[PDB]
C-alpha cells in the first residue's frame, strides 16, 4: 500500500534508476505542506460524527424510500450498517488524504465494493449520493479557520474532493 513517496520510489525502480532531483524536490514540497495536510486529516477525524450525521440526515430527507418498511435502511440493524459504511468510507478517505495517494481506497475499500453492494441488494446510486453528501459536509469542516493558523490550502481541498469523488465513482 503506497503513499506518495513509495509511489515515486516504485516508479523509479520500474525505470531501474535513482530518483531525479526534480522528484526529490516534489517530495520535499510535499513534506513541506505536510503540516497543512495533517491539519486537514485531523479536521476530518474530529468532525467525523457531525459529517456522518449531516450526510445521513440529508440522505434520508432526500430518499424516504430507504427508511420505509422494506427499504434498504429500514430496521435499526440496516440503518446502523448504513452509518457504518459512511464511517468506513470517510475513514479510508482520511487515510488517503494523509498518505497523499488513493491506493488505500482502491486496495482496501473500493476493490470489490460495487459487486458486494449488488450482491447484498443495496441501491448503489444511493450509496454514492451518501458519499457526495459526506464530501459536501466535510468541505465545511476542512475550510474552517478556527483554532488553526490561517493560510491557503486549496490543493488539499481539491485533493480531498477527488478522493471523495473517486470513492463515489468506484461505488456508483
Amino acid at each position: 500500500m503506497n503513499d506518495v513517496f513509495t509511489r515515486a520510489i516504485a516508479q523509479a525502480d520500474l525505470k531501474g534508476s535513482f530518483l531525479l532531483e526534480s522528484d526529490l524536490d516534489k517530495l520535499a514540497s510535499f513534506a513541506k505542506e505536510g503540516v497543512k495536510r495533517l491539519d486537514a486529516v485531523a479536521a476530518l477525524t474530529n468532525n467525523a460524527p457531525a459529517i456522518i450525521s449531516d450526510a445521513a440526515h440529508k440522505l434520508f430527507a432526500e430518499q424516504q424510500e430507504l427508511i420505509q418498511p422494506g427499504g434498504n435502511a429500514y430496521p435499526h440493524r440496516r440503518m446502523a450498517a448504513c452509518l457504518r459504511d459512511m464511517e468506513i468510507i470517510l475513514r479510508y478517505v482520511s487515510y488517503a488524504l494523509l498518505a497523499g495517494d488513493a491506493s488505500v481506497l482502491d486496495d482496501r475499500c473500493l476493490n470489490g465494493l460495487r459487486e458486494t453492494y449488488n450482491a447484498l441488494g443495496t441501491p448503489t446510486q444511493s450509496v454514492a449520493r451518501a458519499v457526495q453528501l459526506m464530501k459536501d459536509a466535510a468541505m465545511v469542516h476542512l475550510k474552517s479557520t478556527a483554532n488553526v493558523t490561517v493560510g491557503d490550502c486549496s490543493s488539499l481541498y481539491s485533493e480531498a474532493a477527488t478522493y471523495f469523488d473517486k470513492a463515489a465513482a468506484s461505488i456508483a
Partner: protein
C-alpha cells in the same frame, strides 16, 4: 497456522481483503426486504413537499 494462542488472520497480503469481497449474504431475496423495482404501499405519515 494459528494454534491455541493466536487469533485468525487472512493469509493473503491484505491488499485484497476478504470481508469486502465476501458479504454475509450474496444474491438472495430477503423477506423483510423489498424488490428494487417495487415501491412502498403503506401509510405516508406525512407529506414533506411532495
Amino acid at each position: 497456522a494459528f494454534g491455541e494462542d493466536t487469533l485468525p488472520y487472512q493469509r493473503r497480503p491484505l491488499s485484497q481483503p476478504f470481508n469486502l469481497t465476501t458479504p454475509r449474504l450474496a444474491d438472495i431475496f430477503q423477506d423483510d426486504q423489498r424488490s428494487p423495482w417495487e415501491r412502498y404501499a403503506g401509510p405516508k405519515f406525512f407529506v414533506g413537499w411532495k
